Design a protein around this ligand. Structure first.
Ligand SMILES: Cn1nc(-c2cccc(-n3ncc4cc(C(C)(C)C)cc(F)c4c3=O)c2CO)cc(Nc2ccc(C(=O)N3CCOCC3)cn2)c1=O
Length: 263
């Protein structure tokens, strides 16, 4: 529990599923981001109970939760501040002129975070470049893990809703609501595709509805130009039609390290 007397509100950082997020300082010293949870957007009591478990998730590649303000409304969520914002927009800025080793290191950052979540049996459920952030050193960290469970908007939570992450979801989620570790694995493969494509929309010439068909029929994202055969094999291995034949994040991490050594 953070005391809101110890916060300031300095600049807007944009809006997400729960409303506005601000940059400010905590204790007059520490940079933070502050989610101000919009009324009606969150299952607040459930989140408050889960925040207790989320306070114990800590890894260098996970955005760090500093605390919450829950003796008031709106509730606030206080985290690590990530100076370069979301990965998706960062990827899309041509000035960065990334080398492919830098792209692979972004995949590795995310894979490390995801291996830690997997070790805790904790699903993200919306892993995608829009839900990763980049700090002032260029390190990518996974954000907003587990928070999909508290979203009240049916357009997000329904698998045929307009906001559901269709292009990041495996067939068994879209058809049956079968969420598992292996559904985050599928999304991670799509995220590597986003990274190697410099932030293109997956299935860029298809709708959500056409994507769900394409993939249920066995077809897959093409190799981005910047991806070697070895990198494409890694992302592609995340998309096996049999969930149980997809790798774990531990295996992915070893594969990524091997390719880094090879390249
Ligand atoms: C910690 N933090 N947070 C956000 C932030 C802000 C708005 C929304 C969200 N967001 N994103 C996804 C999401 C998903 C869900 C589910 C439930 C759908 C998964 C639930 C949610 F609450 C959310 C959610 O709030 C976040 C990330 O949390 C943004 C941060 N930093 C910056 C820094 C710079 C700039 C910028 O302006 N620039 C200018 C151009 O150069 C680059 C930098 C912008 N932001 C930050 O440090």
């Amino acid at each position: 529990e953070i005391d809101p007397k110890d916060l300031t509100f300095l600049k807007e950082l944009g809006t997400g599923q729960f409303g506005v997020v601000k940059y400010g300082k905590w204790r007059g010293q520490y940079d933070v981001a502050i989610k101000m949870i919009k009324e009606g957007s969150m299952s607040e009591d459930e989140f408050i109970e889960e925040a207790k478990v989320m306070m114990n998730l800590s890894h260098e590649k996970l955005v760090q939760l500093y605390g919450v303000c829950t003796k008031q409304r709106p509730i606030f969520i206080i985290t690590e501040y990530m100076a370069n914002g979301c990965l998706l927009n960062y990827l899309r800025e041509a000035r960065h002129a990334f080398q492919t080793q830098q792209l692979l290191e972004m995949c590795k950052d995310v894979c490390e975070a995801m291996e830690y979540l997997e070790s805790k049996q904790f699903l993200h459920r919306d892993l995608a470049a829009r839900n990763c952030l980049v700090n002032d050193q260029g390190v990518v960290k996974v954000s907003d893990f587990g928070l999909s469970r508290y979203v009240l908007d049916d357009e997000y939570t329904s698998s045929v809703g307009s906001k559901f992450p269709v292009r990041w979801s495996p067939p068994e989620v879209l058809m049956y609501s079968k969420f598992s570790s292996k559904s985050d694995i599928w999304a991670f493969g799509v995220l590597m595709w986003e990274i190697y494509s410099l932030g293109k929309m997956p299935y860029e010439r298809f709708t959500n509805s056409e994507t769900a068909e394409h993939i249920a029929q066995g077809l897959r994202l093409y190799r981005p130009h910047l991806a070697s055969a070895a990198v494409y094999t890694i992302m592609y291995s995340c998309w096996h039609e049999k969930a149980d034949e997809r790798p774990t994040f531990k295996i992915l991490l070893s594969n990524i390290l091997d390719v880094m050594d090879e390249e």
